[PDB]
């Protein structure tokens, strides 16, 4: 029966914390502990019930943020870290990303609020990465069982590094500094967070390639350079994986569906020239760096990069002739 004091509820959830954000009327660093520990999974319920999107739910949504917003990791790490049974934490944790995925999509507002926008991403990022270190710490092959969960991250992950991007900040001159100074390029350090967490993953990874196969891409596919180029190492770094399975068989299997989406994407239009440039240039020296499965990869890398220049040459021309 709380449906009608959803709003007037915000109204309190907001003053108080805001109050409690304001600076100097008295120290809440464990106050707002407290009041994250009681109120935390509470919320996230609520707005999941609450999740209708029609009506004053997005106030909802930066009460949440905010919250986290100024609550510090010390917190996240002190009790919501120290649960119950840990399965219970998992429940949570799903719940957490499976929301979130949810807020990426079908966002809250019309675009226009693109400043609070890019602060709640912000606080998106610093509260997966917490999840990303307890997770670690709680779910590495320390807990080396019941360790699929991290589907829902990385697409989550990725679907979070799926939007705000080149062409994005293009729109004035000026607009890619302006978030550059005043944000940076989340991008950057967002792929690298799921680079080290795949690094980290260890020998499990080969329970993992044929679905995380997809990921990889868009994040690949990347406009920019930098965390592209340290990205693409990445796709040697799994088929070599692969090649430890393929002294019992092969990569073919990654290798389809990595051309198939391939495809599917490079026709969809996102990556340049210079992105198969520098893939060829980036997955030779791996091969290099390899013996002779590296040549083989070389060879297939090499249709790869000739089906990138079809599909270029064949964008442009579409674009051009009929």
Same mark, same amino acid.
């Given at each position: ?10 109204? %309190? ?54 919250? %986290? ?17 840990? !399965? ?84 004035? !001159? ?33 329970? +993992? ?33 692969? +090649?430890? +399975? ?77």
């Amino acid at each position: 029966s709380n449906k009608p004091d959803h709003e007037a509820s915000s109204q %309190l959830l907001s003053n108080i914390l805001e109050v409690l954000d304001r600076k100097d009327v008295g120290a809440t660093a464990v106050h707002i502990q407290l009041i994250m520990e009681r109120l935390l999974r509470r919320i996230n319920r609520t707005v999941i019930g609450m999740n209708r999107q029609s009506p004053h739910i997005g106030s909802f949504v930066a009460c949440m943020i905010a919250l %986290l917003q100024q609550m510090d990791d010390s917190h996240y790490s002190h009790y919501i870290s120290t649960f119950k049974t840990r !399965q219970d934490i998992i429940d949570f944790l799903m719940e957490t990303f499976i929301m979130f995925k949810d807020l990426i999509g079908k966002n809250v507002y019309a675009k226009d609020w693109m400043v609070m926008n890019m602060t709640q991403n912000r606080v998106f990022l610093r509260a997966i990465n917490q999840f990303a270190e307890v997770l670690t710490r709680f779910f590495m092959d320390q807990a080396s069982f019941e360790l699929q969960l991290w589907n829902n991250y990385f697409h989550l992950a990725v679907a979070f590094l799926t939007h705000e991007s080149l062409q994005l900040e293009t729109f004035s !001159q000026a607009k890619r500094n302006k978030i550059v100074k005043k944000y940076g390029d989340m991008r950057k350090e967002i792929g690298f967070r799921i680079r080290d967490m795949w690094y980290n993953l260890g020998p499990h990874k080969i329970k +993992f390639i044929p679905s995380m196969v997809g990921p990889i891409l868009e994040v690949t596919l990347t406009p920019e350079v930098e965390l592209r180029k340290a990205t693409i190492p990445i796709f040697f770094d799994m088929m070599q994986c692969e +090649f430890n +399975f393929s002294g019992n068989g092969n990569f073919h299997m990654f290798e389809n569906e990595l051309i198939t989406k391939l495809d599917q994407e490079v026709e969809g239009g996102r990556g340049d020239e210079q992105y198969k440039v520098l893939l060829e240039k980036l997955l030779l020296e791996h091969c290099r760096k390899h013996k002779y499965l590296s040549s083989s990869g070389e060879v297939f890398a090499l249709l790869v990069s000739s089906l990138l220049e079809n599909l270029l040459d064949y964008r442009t021309i579409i674009m051009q002739d009929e």
